[PDB]
Design a binder for this molecule. Structure first.
Ligand SMILES: [Mg+2]
Ligand SMILES: [Mg+2]
Ligand SMILES: [Mg+2]
Ligand SMILES: [Mg+2]
Ligand SMILES: [Mg+2]
Ligand SMILES: [Mg+2]
Ligand SMILES: [Mg+2]
Ligand SMILES: [Mg+2]
Ligand SMILES: [Mg+2]
Ligand SMILES: [Mg+2]
Ligand SMILES: [Mg+2]
Ligand SMILES: [Mg+2]
Ligand SMILES: [Mg+2]
Ligand SMILES: [Mg+2]
Ligand SMILES: [Mg+2]
Ligand SMILES: [Mg+2]
Ligand SMILES: [Mg+2]
Ligand SMILES: [Mg+2]
Ligand SMILES: [Mg+2]
Ligand SMILES: [Mg+2]
Ligand SMILES: [Mg+2]
Ligand SMILES: [Mg+2]
Ligand SMILES: [Mg+2]
Ligand SMILES: [Mg+2]
Ligand SMILES: [Mg+2]
Ligand SMILES: [Mg+2]
Ligand SMILES: [Mg+2]
Ligand SMILES: [Mg+2]
Ligand SMILES: [Mg+2]
Ligand SMILES: [Mg+2]
Ligand SMILES: [Mg+2]
Ligand SMILES: [Mg+2]
Ligand SMILES: [Mg+2]
Ligand SMILES: [Mg+2]
Ligand SMILES: [Mg+2]
Ligand SMILES: [Mg+2]
Ligand SMILES: [Mg+2]
Ligand SMILES: [Mg+2]
Ligand SMILES: [Mg+2]
Lengths: 100, 59, 77, 56, 22, 124, 146
RNA sequence: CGCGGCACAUCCACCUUGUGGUGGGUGUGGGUAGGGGAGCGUCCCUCAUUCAGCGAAGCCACCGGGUGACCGGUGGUGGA
RNA sequence: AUGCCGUGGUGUAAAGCGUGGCAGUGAGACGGCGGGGGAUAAGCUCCGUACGUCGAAAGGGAAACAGCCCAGAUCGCCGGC
RNA sequence: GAGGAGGGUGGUGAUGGCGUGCCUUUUGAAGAAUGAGCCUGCGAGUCAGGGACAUGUCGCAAGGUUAACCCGUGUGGGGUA
């Protein structure tokens, strides 16, 4: 069985035992989180109903907070002399799915 | 009664009496709502800016 | 080329016209309507002036009106 | 102290005529962009003593 | 004068709204 | 205090040339011609981190539109029927079920078709 | 991670399209989608997915009366004054397979992989095709009701 | 619009209530000429401290770090 | 009709004014509307316009296309409208 | 780890989309306007003055401060014109 889970304003297709990188959830390493779903497929049934999916949640287990890939930004316009340099590391969260 | 104004189009390429009329209604960006009273000065602000907004009789 | 600069000259604009409108509080001596001639005439508490300048003699509000065809400028004291 | 372009030896003439050569115009051989030329805005002898008041 | 007329008549599209530069 | 410029100046040249490995011509060997290319290679990465959010949506739709038409419905009416039934599955996962689990996509077609209004051309 | 197809996953089949009363626009469109694999949910624009298309009966395609006279086909040889022109009506007598095949190849994308896509297309004039060693299933035109 | 990071301004509550710090709202952050504010890097002197013939400077390669100029780690070469 | 000056309500943080420090600019272009010059010719020229955009503005559309339409990029996202 | 499958560094990149170098100067240039063959090195708002104006800070405060010069190995102490 699998389920489409909502977290961080985005959606992820998970199964029991997958590892999903999501946005920074305010939780320390080892805690449990509960997340809402948008679809649950349990074989040949899809369950497809907004009233019946609010009672179903995915139990997570945080492995730890990681960083993203370094993004180097150097904006530039042609014959003016404009330069702007900037970097970024998106803070992420590794999350084990043990529920559904 | 009490009106609800939702901005639909931008202020880019709008005139001075239209940008400043959205500033008095309290609108900032596209799809921003505000609730104002239906005195005779609000629908004079609306009549200048009626191509940029979307008024409705909403509580 | 035909040198048709037979007429290429002008004077300076003199900034005439009405300077203090109706319902507007003035001080003693304020110039109300600078003008050529008496387009406007002096009424109550308004003097004419040397070049028909229509100043003020007393502080108050300015109101316009008619007095037998000739239109006047007056001040309510 | 260093030498400016009016104290470096020589460089009094113009090395070649201005138009026709296909080189850049130069005007002197001790101009500051030349190797060997003078130093622009370089050091000079200075006295750095300040005037602190007696009560301070 | 085909170029001067064909560049001018392409402002009558729905996107340009009857206006183009030059 | 005379400063030889070379220890400061080589710092910004070793990192431009490490970011230019894999370019061809003078654009990987020379500093003046690999600083011009890095000015373009970071405007292109900026322009295309924002373009690919549309590019994958443009691919997910074409895999839903291909998989909706194996179940005699257009993409036009599948998105309508999945908002009229309260199925908020995004187009990334809706295009991943269509490849990886086709019997779970026929059920979302029969949910969206039955929730669709009966005369789709009649006014509301 | 969205699906990007491996090499060795694209499974190809063989279709055959009759053209006895079909117009040239409906048939070139339905052959262009079927060669590229737009009808498959595993589509990727950089992978030559898609099946084979055998167009039989191309001498009987539905072209109007005013297009066998006034629609021209231009080739240019490179030499000056080397512009030649032939009508559709004098190409439907000698080479009727070229008229159907030109309409398909203007509807493929103008890139390098379309030159591998067009190697999966066989256009014939009569009702007989040599590819009976394979098993081509017939393909009729369908429009999804809306 | 949603979720997460940063900066500036303003307002409301705390801490030696302006030298200003911590927390919470709303707003704002395209930019040439130019104005303002805050920083990285090379060198030199002085004060304190600490490495170095058990291998300093410099150079080369690799693995990592910071919002930027840039930085650190390990190894190879090298000789104050 | 609009515009303009005055005044009484209401609304809106980054509006106005005085005085100092430091500037840059003083070659503008096209589009809509009102006009002069020109043959009511010009991608022509000279003015008006609390008109717009470019200049100094990326992104989407007009095939391509400083000046036209939509919209103003703080950064990330393989989320929606 | 003998090999294969799984996962991850590093190197290459078949193929798809998007995409008009840099500087100067201009109303506007990828421009068929200027400048540069390449690399390493050098190469441009500095200094003098009890100057001038305006500020940030420190000492003294109805007063503030000395210049020349004199005496000390010094950066210290005198010196009221
Ligand atoms: Mg420019
Ligand atoms: Mg006159
Ligand atoms: Mg007289
Ligand atoms: Mg000399
Ligand atoms: Mg000379
Ligand atoms: Mg010398
Ligand atoms: Mg002394
Ligand atoms: Mg390469
Ligand atoms: Mg988007
Ligand atoms: Mg194309
Ligand atoms: Mg912005
Ligand atoms: Mg800015
Ligand atoms: Mg600037
Ligand atoms: Mg050794
Ligand atoms: Mg050294
Ligand atoms: Mg290093
Ligand atoms: Mg080392
Ligand atoms: Mg070493
Ligand atoms: Mg001038
Ligand atoms: Mg001028
Ligand atoms: Mg002008
Ligand atoms: Mg012009
Ligand atoms: Mg105009
Ligand atoms: Mg006109
Ligand atoms: Mg001109
Ligand atoms: Mg602007
Ligand atoms: Mg300019
Ligand atoms: Mg633009
Ligand atoms: Mg554009
Ligand atoms: Mg385009
Ligand atoms: Mg939609
Ligand atoms: Mg490519
Ligand atoms: Mg010019
Ligand atoms: Mg050139
Ligand atoms: Mg060229
Ligand atoms: Mg020139
Ligand atoms: Mg040259
Ligand atoms: Mg050179
Ligand atoms: Mg003081």
């Amino acid at each position: 069985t699998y389920a489409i889970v909502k977290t961080g304003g985005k959606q992820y297709k998970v199964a029991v035992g997958d590892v999903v990188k999501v946005e920074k959830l305010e939780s320390e390493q080892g805690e449990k989180v509960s997340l809402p779903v948008a679809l649950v497929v349990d074989g040949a049934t899809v369950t497809t109903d907004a009233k019946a999916l609010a009672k179903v949640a995915v139990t997570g287990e945080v492995l730890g907070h990681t960083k993203g890939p370094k993004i180097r930004i150097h904006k530039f316009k042609n014959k003016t002399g404009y330069h702007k340099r900037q970097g970024h590391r998106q803070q992420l969260t590794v999350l084990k799915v043990t529920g559904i | 009664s009490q009106l609800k104004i939702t901005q639909v189009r931008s202020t880019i390429g709008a005139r001075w009496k239209q940008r400043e009329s959205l500033r008095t209604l309290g609108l900032r960006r596209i799809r921003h709502s505000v609730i104002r009273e239906d005195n005779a000065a609000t629908r004079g602000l609306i009549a200048v800016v009626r191509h940029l907004v979307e008024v409705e009789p909403a509580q | 080329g035909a040198s048709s600069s037979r007429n290429g000259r002008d004077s300076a604009a003199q900034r005439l016209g009405v300077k203090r409108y109706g319902g507007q509080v003035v001080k003693a001596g304020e110039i109300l309507v600078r003008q050529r001639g008496t387009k406007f005439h002096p009424g109550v508490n308004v003097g004419r002036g040397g070049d028909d300048t229509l100043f003020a003699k007393t502080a108050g509000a300015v109101e316009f009106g008619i007095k037998r065809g000739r239109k006047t400028v007056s001040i309510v004291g | 102290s260093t030498k400016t372009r009016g104290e470096v030896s020589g460089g009094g003439r113009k090395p070649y005529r201005q138009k026709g050569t296909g080189r850049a115009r130069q005007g002197s051989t001790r101009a500051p962009q030349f190797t060997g030329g003078g130093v622009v805005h370089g050091p000079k002898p200075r006295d750095y003593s300040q005037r602190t008041p007696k009560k301070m | 004068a085909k170029r001067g007329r064909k560049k001018r008549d392409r402002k009558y599209s729905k996107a340009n709204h009857g206006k183009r530069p030059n | 205090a005379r400063v030889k410029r070379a220890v400061n100046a080589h710092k910004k040249r070793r990192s431009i040339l490490k970011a230019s490995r894999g370019y061809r011509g003078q654009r990987s060997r020379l500093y003046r011609k690999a600083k011009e290319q890095q000015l373009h290679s970071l405007n292109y990465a900026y322009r295309d981190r924002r373009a690919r959010k549309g590019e994958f949506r443009k691919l997910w739709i074409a895999r839903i539109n291909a998989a909706a038409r194996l179940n005699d419905i257009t993409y036009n009416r599948l998105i309508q029927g999945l908002k009229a039934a309260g199925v908020e599955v995004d187009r990334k996962n809706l295009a991943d079920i269509a490849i990886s689990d086709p019997a779970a996509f026929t059920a979302l077609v029969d949910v969206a078709r039955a929730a669709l209004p009966e005369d789709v051309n009649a006014p509301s | 991670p969205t699906y990007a197809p491996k090499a060795g996953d694209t499974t190809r089949s063989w279709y055959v399209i009759d053209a006895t009363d079909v117009v040239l626009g409906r048939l070139a469109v339905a052959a262009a989608n079927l060669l590229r694999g737009k009808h498959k949910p595993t589509f990727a624009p950089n992978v030559d997915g898609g099946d084979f298309v055998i167009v039989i009966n191309a001498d009987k395609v539905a072209i109007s009366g005013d297009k066998l006279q006034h629609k021209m086909v231009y080739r240019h040889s490179g030499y000056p004054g080397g512009l030649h022109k032939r009508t559709i009506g004098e190409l439907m007598q000698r080479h009727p397979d070229r008229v159907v095949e030109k309409a398909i190849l203007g509807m493929l994308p103008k890139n390098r992989l379309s030159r591998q896509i067009q190697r999966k297309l066989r256009v014939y004039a009569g009702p007989e095709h040599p590819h009976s060693a394979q098993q081509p299933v017939p393909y009729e035109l369908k429009q999804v009701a809306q």
